[PDB]
């Protein structure tokens, strides 16, 4: 339980640092979730992408 007083110990007894944490925490979270949707997608669909076309370079 000692991380709960220590995380309030440092940052928000102030109101501009706080607005850093909700803006900058909106980014690491948006990139943590865009990364996991973009790897559950290319694992359900193997052999179905555009770069998996066996005759791609050669039309002639």
């Amino acid at each position: 339980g000692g991380i709960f007083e220590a995380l309030y110990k440092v940052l928000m007894r102030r109101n501009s640092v706080y607005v850093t944490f909700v803006i900058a925490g909106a980014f690491v979270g948006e990139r943590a979730v865009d990364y996991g949707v973009h790897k559950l997608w290319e694992h359900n669909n193997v052999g179905k992408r555009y770069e998996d076309i066996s005759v791609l370079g050669q039309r002639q």
Binding site: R14, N15, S16, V17, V19, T20, I23, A24, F27, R31
Partner: peptide, 29 residues
């Protein structure tokens, strides 16, 4: 006074690093 100075500065460095947080977007870090 002098608190409201610096307390103007802490969230004046929020805009800078909050509009430096919606357009150009180095995103690995």
């Amino acid at each position: 006074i002098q608190p409201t100075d610096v307390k103007a500065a802490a969230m004046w460095g929020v805009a800078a690093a909050t509009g430096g947080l919606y357009l150009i977007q180095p995103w690995g870090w």
